[PDB]
């Protein structure tokens, strides 16, 4: 006859599918916790250490699931904790539900301890942000903030007074609509635009096709039109797995984390094919200056010629594109444009192999990923933080599309490596689920270590230890007039703050030590997390869009230059095989 | 000739006397890292773990000193971190500058990496908010925002387009106005509103003055006033120090952070004078509810009446005023109220030291803070975390006027514990320093105990881990029907935190352990910082706003009950000193 | 080889069809008012008296032709004005483009005249809501704000620094996406979905089709489903005229703008078809609170069991799905339930009538109403005020598929009257244009009839003349225990109004002055705009929620003083057609 507001929060919350939610309790928010507490079979609450972790790990459950992810601070300091989570959310256009606690209705603008107006903190973050004032409606406004967040892609909001979930409301009134929810039936990608597009990418010379995640239901397709008409494949990093790495005419991702080829071919290419791609670096790197013919497919309107004049613009599902010029394409024999960036590929992958089987000595951020690929599984799922590992990652980790990886990918937001792996584990117990993070990201979050701890999550961290921010000490290379600031730091032992977080650890500092810990590392993660910290030199990783390896634009002094400082003597610019299959730049 | 805008927006600074700053960098803010590179021997540039941390040591260093605090963020994901540290300095009204890093002019709406508009996000918790969009009027914007900071007491930010700071200027044309910058020579207090609300206090039978720490100045007066006319003090948690500890008339503070006899006492008063306080408890604990007259002292024309329906309320200066009262007042005669309150006080002092005085056995938060005050300089700052440390700690530390406390008055953000310390250490390189944090929130900042290897701040770090959010635990037994939920969690060890960020540290778990490891932290602290892990048992501190003591107001059973529960056996109840002096309730 | 970045924005603005814009000029604003300038001959300047009316007339395009709409005010008061129509365009979901003033950027940040940060202004109203800091980039961030709203279908507001739109750009370099542009994708109905809808459709004893603005394109459908199925039909009030009121099965709209045959029958409803509807009343007045089932057809994924829980959701287009549902279903025989909704609606319909067809007497709104009948082409465009006009506009005019009628539907601002005609002329011309506005509304935005004249835009301007807020008046009667406040006023003769702004007018107070003055009206608005003053009683329309004609229902006397007060002694109440046919009530 009558239920708490609370307990039927919680309904519409099971209601949606929603399996675990992060944060931390306090007053504000202890009648939420009260309602939670009676549903432990049903729902998993996840108490971390930080109410940002709990943010991250909740846009970590969307990137990963689709599913919402579920978060909650208390009033005041808990709910700006969340912060950085929940613009990560908003930025990697994902579904959030946060719940920020508050004083009761009876306190509220009386200006009492850790009281505010908290509305407008999360105005700009949210796409939906309300306070709830009455209890009888609080069960649809969660209903509503959680089909909005689905429907927008973005982050809901709602701050509860605390006295509400306590109140009686009539069991019958609320409910969730969860049962509605739905994926749209498409109408066919249109027709005579697509045919329109498909002729002006096949009589192109030099194309190129540069997909991001809105393709990645298109991995096959992507491959076999590749192979078919015989056009090299570049993607968004994030996109890259979408096309296993191994395939031969994978170029890579374009700027900085970057591939050589990717940049180097852009550079050449008269026609773009960009799908389902929100590359940022379009306009500000001048990337599609030398294009001839831009062509898109996006299923967004509001992306329609936003990053480039577009030639071709067709709005549609990226797969079923794909599929519908793939079905009226038919074989192309090799071409030179083809051979010379498949020859290309060929001389970077012998490069960074290289760096990779280095067997002794110091040891680099190479041999550490090397490390990784041994002991990977073919659907291991890597979450990955903020700095050169991103770089590092992109180049080395060896993906198909059996696996995920993740990172905060626009907003940028270090500390994402731990709280993305807490999420992975969470959703895949079955899974090898890797934590890839620099020293400095991982000693913004590194307390909820002892999350994957107290609940049992076999992450494998592995700590890139530079003792700097690496990232930016590369940047003030480039652009600072004056000496390094703030970019060379302390060493911190992370198998000492594992030891600490009660998680077993290694230090490793030469190239040699690898095998053994790693090894042992995929063992203790059968059943408990382990962390790894890799004291790594602060070898600067080579440049992709800084390149000096072509005689006819840079000086034979800055090639030798670049050549000795990113152990690149064997690597050949792009013109050099242009030429040797007979074409010109 | 000329100058970059950079390097004349930190001469803005040197010439406001800002002597330390933090953030960390980012290509977003490596231009004024860049100015500030030039400038290490005039201003100190501390690199923090994570951005909070200097947010809140920002709001620390004006807390403690009255000079503006500055912090920064990098575009994004820097600047959102500063969150807790910003919001903290809003609620404790100090002026602290922000400085967040954006994408030059010519990227900005673009959507591209890290970029968005700022803007919004710092428009709540900002007195002053705004995007810098030319490099010459830059420094007038910088020195604009300092000097609303110091007028308004809160937060400026700054939104820096990367460009602009390596932009050259005239260099003839900036100015700072630092040299303008003095403090009001205010009237003399009210004469007739003085006298009439000195008759007030006087005509009362049972007067309190109840000061904030707007009557931080008047330590003197406060307690001569009461020596003279027989009237207790009390005070607001934060006000604590400002009359010695010792003081005999001293009651406490009341509410939850609260001592006995000042909530007892508080609800007998007729006549309160509440000088320089602003109680955010006053209306929903009803703390004035019996009180006949209400009598006010108060600098900001916006606190007059606010609390509670008042009588007098003078506008004027605490100190001033209360130095008035005094030169028209004579000796009184002790009375039953003063002898009733003072054996209160020395009842309840006696219960605090036999909690303390415990020399062997399972260790608790009495015996630890019992441990700090034997190796506590008389001039010792403390940095104070949240929870039941600040409950702990308001109860049995031993301040004096030369000392120093803080914490997170209002906002109440846990994490404060170590960035407090680190301000107070780089302030007064000469006094000892301690940080009070519970295991909770010193997780939530311990990367940052790196900070204070690393620019070798002596902080004493005491850690009080009972793994719990213990304040909140106890919270839920008050108000929850289910059972803890996320208030009990596990373990981490801090002293092997410390070892990996390179610093000494001690556990300890028993009574008897505490001179040794104490004795050997404070000489440890003659020179590097140093931890103290102190595992404690999770025994609820004694509720002073649930005292179970009195016959006439609490069963048998509950007084029993209580006096088992919280080693209370010998505490008396307020009444029966009343009683014993002639009075009734 | 240079462009001005103001004739850049100008070529965008035409790249995406913009015929015409409103606004007022100032300092702030004058490089656009430049540019605009030099283009008068391609798009076309509408000087508004007052910027709301331009931000109103742009939301109004917007709601008439899809084309986004586009204002502009100058910094601080001439943005500010533009409010009421921006949440207009908010709420009614259309595309606007706002252009705000500001001063150079050179000025920004200085604190000089009507120079302020002006983005949190907008930050609530905006879809994208940004300040433009570069010239060159300009262009673009119109571009991208137009495809935003668009996509959107909101308000973008850029606020734009005066010195830019004077600067130089390279002349190749800024385009626009408008020749990319495409509306969003119509989702497809599931076949099986659709199959059960139509089953428990069937089944139903007490079936509704209730639709709104979202079947706007199923007119057809819709009544070829009523007469199929025999299932009576309703609406929101918006979509009054998608089928043609003449319809006998055409119950009305619910709630207060209603018709009383439609909240009847949706009283006893066993089953809703709602389509196309987010009738913002379903959940404060219970409508659906008796429906056993409910079934929804909508594009949008957020709409889905938001107004009441769904027993099958349809996602998609609701032509395609009505289509889907008329080509399984053949013709069924008449029901009861058709027959007494048949019935009731013919009761309806004749009261309305008699109130039209008074000869003589004092004016009321009916007869007024009766002779923009009269008058009025078969495709004549009525914008509404809102007031009392709404729902007698919804009772009496006549309107089929080929009219148009606008109001500010959900915001409901007053005063749209006037810009909503204005917008009408200026993309019709050819097309008869009603002004239907209450006295209190008209007066908000009264100046701009001087906007008509100086376009030369024959608009029929037609007052209702009451010298109360009836609408409100009416409220306060029902809700208010003291006397009637602020809801009768002072006359305004609004024919001398217009007479003041050079507009020829008329004013009557009687029925039988109608027919001659509106035949005058009529012939002026062949060439000019013209004014119909209606000076008319202060009777309150019949409250379709507040009937008394039950006698199972109301006393004998509520039901007399009903008749009486209405002129309803000839309306039946539902239930005697119910019981006529064999149903119960
Ligand atoms: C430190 C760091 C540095 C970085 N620098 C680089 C870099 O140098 N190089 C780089 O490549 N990346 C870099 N990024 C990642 C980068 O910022 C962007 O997030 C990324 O390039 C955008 O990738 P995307 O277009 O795949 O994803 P999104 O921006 O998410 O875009 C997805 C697009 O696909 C569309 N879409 C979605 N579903 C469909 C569908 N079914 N059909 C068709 N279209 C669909 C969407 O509308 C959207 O346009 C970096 C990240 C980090 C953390
Ligand atoms: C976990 C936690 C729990 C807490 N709970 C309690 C509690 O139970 N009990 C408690 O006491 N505190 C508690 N607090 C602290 C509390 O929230 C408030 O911050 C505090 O009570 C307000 O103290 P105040 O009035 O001294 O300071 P403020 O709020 O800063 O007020 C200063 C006042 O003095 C005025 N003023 C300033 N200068 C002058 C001057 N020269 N002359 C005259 N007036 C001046 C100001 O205008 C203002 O009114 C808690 C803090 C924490 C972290
Ligand atoms: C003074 C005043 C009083 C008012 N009071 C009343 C009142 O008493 N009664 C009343 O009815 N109205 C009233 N309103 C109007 C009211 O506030 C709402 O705007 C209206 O009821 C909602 O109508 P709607 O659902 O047609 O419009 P919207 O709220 O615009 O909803 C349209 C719906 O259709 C969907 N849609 C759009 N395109 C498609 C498509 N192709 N296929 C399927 N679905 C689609 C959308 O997603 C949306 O859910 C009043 C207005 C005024 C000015
Ligand atoms: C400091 C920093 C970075 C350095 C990361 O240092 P790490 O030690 O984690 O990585 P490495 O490069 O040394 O291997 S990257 C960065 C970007 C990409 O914006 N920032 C700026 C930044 C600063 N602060 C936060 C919270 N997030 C950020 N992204
Ligand atoms: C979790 C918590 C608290 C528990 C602190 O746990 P601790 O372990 O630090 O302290 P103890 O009580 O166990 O000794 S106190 C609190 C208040 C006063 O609001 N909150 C809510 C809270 C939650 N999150 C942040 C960042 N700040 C907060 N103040
Ligand atoms: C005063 C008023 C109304 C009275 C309209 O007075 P009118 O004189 O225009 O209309 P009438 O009813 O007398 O024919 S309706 C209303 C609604 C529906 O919200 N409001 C409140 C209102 C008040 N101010 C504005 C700008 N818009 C509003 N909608
Ligand atoms: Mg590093
Ligand atoms: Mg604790
Ligand atoms: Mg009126
Ligand atoms: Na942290």
């Given at each position: 006859?009558?239920?708490?507001?609370?307990?039927?929060?919680?309904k519409?919350?099971?209601?949606?599918?929603?399996?675990?939610?992060?944060?931390?309790?306090?007053?504000?928010?202890?009648?939420?916790?009260?309602?939670?507490?009676?549903?432990?079979?049903?729902?998993?609450?996840?108490?971390?250490?930080?109410?940002?972790?709990?943010?991250?790990?909740?846009?970590?459950?969307?990137?990963?699931?689709?599913?919402?992810?579920?978060?909650?601070?208390?009033?005041?300091?808990?709910?700006?904790?969340?912060?950085?989570?929940?613009?990560?959310?908003?930025?990697?256009?994902?579904?959030?539900?946060?719940?920020?606690?508050?004083?009761?209705?009876?306190?509220?603008?009386?200006?009492?301890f850790?009281?505010?107006?908290?509305?407008?903190?999360?105005?700009?973050?949210?796409?939906?942000?309300?306070?709830?004032?009455?209890?009888?409606?609080?069960?649809?406004?969660?209903?509503?903030?959680?089909?909005?967040?689905?429907?927008?892609?973005?982050?809901?909001?709602?701050?509860?007074?605390?006295?509400?979930?306590?109140?009686?409301?009539?069991?019958?009134?609320?409910?969730?609509?969860?049962?509605?929810?739905?994926?749209?039936?498409?109408?066919?990608?249109?027709?005579?635009?697509?045919?329109?597009?498909?002729?002006?990418?096949?009589?192109?010379?030099?194309?190129?096709?540069?997909?991001?995640?809105?393709?990645?239901?298109?991995?096959?397709?992507?491959?076999?039109?590749?192979?078919?008409?015989?056009?090299?494949?570049?993607?968004?990093?994030?996109?890259?797995?979408?096309?296993?790495?191994?395939?031969?005419?994978?170029?890579?991702?374009?700027?900085?984390?970057?591939?050589?080829?990717?940049?180097?071919?852009?550079?050449?290419?008269?026609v773009?094919?960009?799908?389902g791609?929100?590359?940022?670096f379009?306009?500000?790197?001048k990337?599609?200056?030398?294009?001839?013919?831009?062509?898109?497919?996006?299923?967004?309107?509001?992306?329609?010629?936003?990053?480039?004049?577009?030639?071709?613009?067709?709005?549609?599902?990226?797969?079923?594109?794909?599929?519908?010029?793939?079905?009226?394409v038919?074989?192309?024999?090799?071409?030179?444009?083809?051979?010379?960036?498949?020859?290309?590929?060929?001389?970077?992958?012998?490069?960074?192999?290289?760096?990779?089987?280095?067997?002794?000595?110091?040891?680099?951020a190479?041999?550490?990923?090397?490390?990784?690929?041994?002991?990977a599984?073919?659907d291991?799922?890597?979450?990955?933080?903020?700095?050169?590992?991103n770089?590092?990652?992109?180049?080395?980790?060896?993906?198909?599309?059996?696996?995920?990886?993740?990172?905060?990918?626009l907003?940028?937001?270090?500390?994402?490596?731990?709280?993305?792996?807490?999420?992975?584990?969470?959703?895949?117990?079955?899974?090898?689920?890797?934590?890839?993070?620099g020293?400095?990201?991982?000693?913004?979050?590194?307390?909820?270590?002892?999350?994957?701890?107290?609940?049992?999550?076999?992450?494998?961290?592995?700590?890139?230890?530079?003792?700097?921010?690496?990232?930016?000490?590369?940047?003030?290379?480039?652009?600072?007039?004056?000496?390094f600031?703030?970019?060379?730091?302390?060493?911190?032992?992370?198998?000492?703050?594992?030891?600490?977080?009660?998680?077993?650890?290694?230090?490793?500092?030469?190239?040699?030590?690898?095998?053994?810990?790693?090894?042992?590392?995929?063992?203790?993660?059968?059943?408990?997390?382990?962390?790894?910290?890799?004291?790594?030199?602060?070898?600067?990783?080579?440049?992709?869009?800084?390149?000096?390896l072509?005689?006819?634009?840079?000086?034979?002094?800055?090639?030798?230059?670049?050549?000795?400082?990113?152990?690149?003597?064997?690597?050949?610019?792009?013109?050099?095989y242009?030429?040797?299959?007979?074409?010109?730049?």
């Amino acid at each position: 006859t009558n239920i708490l507001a609370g307990a039927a929060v919680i309904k519409v919350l099971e209601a949606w599918g929603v399996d675990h939610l992060y944060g931390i309790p306090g007053g504000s928010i202890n009648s939420i916790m009260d309602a939670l507490s009676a549903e432990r079979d049903r729902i998993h609450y996840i108490q971390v250490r930080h109410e940002e972790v709990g943010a991250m790990a909740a846009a970590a459950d969307a990137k990963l699931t689709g599913k919402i992810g579920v978060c909650f601070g208390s009033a005041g300091p808990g709910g700006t904790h969340l912060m950085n989570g929940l613009y990560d959310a908003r930025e990697d256009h994902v579904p959030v539900l946060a719940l920020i606690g508050q004083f009761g209705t009876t306190g509220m603008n009386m200006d009492t301890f850790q009281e505010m107006n908290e509305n407008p903190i999360y105005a700009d973050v949210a796409d939906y942000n309300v306070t709830a004032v009455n209890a009888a409606t609080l069960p649809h406004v969660i209903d509503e903030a959680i089909r909005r967040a689905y429907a927008h892609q973005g982050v809901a909001v709602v701050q509860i007074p605390v006295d509400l979930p306590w109140q009686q409301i009539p069991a019958e009134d609320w409910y969730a609509s969860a049962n509605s929810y739905q994926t749209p039936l498409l109408p066919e990608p249109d027709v005579q635009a697509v045919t329109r597009l498909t002729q002006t990418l096949l009589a192109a010379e030099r194309p190129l096709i540069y997909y991001g995640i809105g393709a990645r239901k298109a991995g096959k397709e992507l491959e076999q039109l590749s192979k078919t008409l015989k056009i090299p494949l570049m993607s968004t990093y994030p996109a890259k797995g979408i096309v296993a790495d191994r395939y031969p005419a994978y170029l890579g991702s374009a700027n900085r984390v970057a591939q050589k080829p990717a940049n180097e071919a852009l550079a050449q290419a008269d026609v773009v094919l960009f799908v389902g791609n929100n590359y940022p670096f379009a306009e500000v790197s001048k990337a599609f200056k030398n294009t001839r013919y831009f062509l898109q497919i996006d299923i967004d309107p509001a992306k329609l010629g936003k990053r480039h004049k577009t030639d071709i613009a067709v709005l549609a599902d990226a797969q079923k594109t794909l599929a519908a010029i793939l079905a009226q394409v038919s074989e192309r024999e090799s071409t030179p444009w083809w051979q010379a960036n498949l020859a290309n590929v060929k001389n970077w992958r012998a490069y960074l192999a290289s760096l990779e089987d280095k067997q002794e000595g110091p040891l680099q951020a190479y041999q550490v990923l090397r490390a990784v690929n041994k002991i990977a599984e073919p659907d291991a799922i890597y979450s990955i933080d903020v700095g050169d590992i991103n770089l590092n990652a992109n180049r080395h980790l060896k993906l198909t599309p059996s696996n995920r990886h993740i990172t905060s990918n626009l907003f940028a937001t270090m500390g994402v490596g731990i709280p993305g792996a807490i999420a992975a584990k969470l959703n895949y117990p079955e899974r090898q689920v890797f934590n890839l993070a620099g020293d400095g990201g991982a000693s913004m979050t590194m307390q909820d270590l002892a999350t994957q701890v107290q609940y049992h999550l076999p992450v494998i961290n592995v700590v890139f230890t530079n003792c700097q921010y690496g990232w930016i000490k590369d940047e003030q290379e480039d652009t600072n007039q004056n000496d390094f600031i703030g970019v060379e730091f302390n060493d911190i032992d992370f198998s000492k703050i594992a030891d600490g977080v009660h998680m077993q650890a290694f230090r490793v500092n030469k190239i040699e030590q690898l095998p053994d810990v790693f090894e042992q590392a995929k063992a203790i993660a059968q059943h408990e997390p382990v962390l790894i910290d890799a004291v790594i030199t602060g070898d600067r990783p080579l440049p992709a869009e800084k390149l000096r390896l072509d005689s006819a634009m840079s000086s034979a002094a800055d090639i030798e230059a670049f050549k000795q400082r990113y152990e690149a003597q064997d690597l050949q610019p792009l013109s050099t095989y242009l030429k040797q299959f007979g074409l010109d730049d």
